[PDB]
Amino acid sequence: MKFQYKEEHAFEKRRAEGDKIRRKYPDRVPVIVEKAPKARIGDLDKKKYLVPSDLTVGQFYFLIRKRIHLRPEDALFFFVNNVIPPTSATMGSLYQEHHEEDYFLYIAYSDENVYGMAKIN
Questions:
Q1: Is the four-CA dihedral 47, 50, 56, 62 of positive or negative sign?
Q2: Contact at 8 Å (CB) between 77 and 109?
Q3: Which residues, at least 6 apart from 47, have a Cβ–Cβ distance to it below 8 Å?
Q4: Its GO CC terms (predicted)?
Q5: Which H or E run includes 13?
Q6: Residue 4, SS3 per DSSP
Q7: Concatenated DSSP letters for 33-89?
Q8: What domains can you pick out in the chain, each with its CATH number?
């Protein structure tokens, strides 16, 4: 997973922005959300989110599903450093555990969970 936000903005500019956001909004965390490349699912209009630290991952799933207009029966998975976060975790806790050196949390989303199926060849 290569994030386009990182292709569009150099590291030092990203780190300055992420640091500034966390100081300006200490009760929020900055998050980059992008589609896994070969995922078969709708796109997001915005990559950069400022999220309440106490929002749960489950709540964030609901909001991202709504932004792409998914039906309830459609699947959606988040990946942070290739691990699927639990829905009960807060976005703040996920940020503190996994944010990168630019002070952003990076989430990839997909229609598919590799971990849940056995691909033969």
A1: negative
A2: yes
A3: 4, 5, 32, 33, 34
A4: amphisome; autolysosome; autophagosome; autophagosome membrane; cytoplasmic vesicle; endomembrane system; type I terminal bouton
A5: helix 11-24
A6: helix
A7: EEE-TT--SPPPS--EEEEETT-BHHHHHHHHHHHHT--TTS--EEEBTTBPPPTTS
A8: 4-110 (3.10.20.90)
Determined by which method?
X-ray
User: Resolution of this entry in Å?
Assistant: 1.4
Beta strand 105-110 pairing with 48-52: unpaired
Contacts of 54 (CB under 8 A, 6+ apart): 27, 90, 91, 92
Q: Which residue's entry shows tokens 């450093």? A: 81
83 - beta bridge partners?
80
Q: Which of 3, 58, 11 is nearest to 31 (CA)?
A: 3
